[PDB]
């Protein structure tokens, strides 16, 4: 279902269009619980639910409110595999050069 392929330099709006939300905090886990800190590097609402068909708040459970963004934790209810493709983006404070086009040699 895929004719010829196209490659081009990505516009910033294109990049932000390749995301549901923006990461804003470097964090991995609680180190006490499995807490995916809000706006963390593995943020639940930017990437998906850590466990299949669940909300981090735990309100909904495993099929009933499928594909629901939990009003409290703000997370879709879908399979953990959805985490595999949901891209994110970090907004840069200042414009920053892309090395690849700087050093194509």
């Amino acid at each position: 279902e895929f004719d010829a392929i196209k490659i081009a330099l990505a516009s910033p709006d294109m990049i932000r269009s390749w995301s549901f939300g923006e990461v804003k905090k470097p964090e991995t886990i609680n180190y006490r619980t499995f807490k995916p800190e809000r706006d963390g590097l593995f943020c639940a609402r930017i990437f998906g639910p850590v466990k299949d068909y669940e909300c981090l708040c735990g309100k909904y459970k495993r099929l009933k409110h499928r594909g629901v963004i939990c009003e409290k934790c703000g997370v879709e209810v879908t399979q953990t595999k959805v985490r595999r493709e949901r891209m994110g983006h970090i907004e840069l404070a200042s414009p920053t050069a892309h090395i690849w086009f700087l050093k194509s040699l």
């Binding site: 279902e1 895929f2 004719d3 196209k6 330099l9 990505a10 891209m87 892309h98 690849w100």
Partner: protein, 49 residues
């Protein structure tokens, strides 16, 4: 469907045991992984027709 596609592997096994001989038409997920890899870089790498 016989190297890495877990979903394809399972679907094909279902079809074989169910008595249906049929692959599932669709781009292998390896293409999707590569596409997201490129999109990590600021490259459009879009599809076409």
């Amino acid at each position: 469907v016989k190297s890495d596609d877990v979903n394809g592997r399972t679907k094909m096994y279902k079809n074989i045991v169910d008595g249906n001989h049929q692959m599932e038409p669709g781009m292998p997920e390896s293409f999707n992984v590569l596409l997201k890899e490129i999109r990590s870089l600021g490259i459009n790498i879009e599809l076409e027709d």
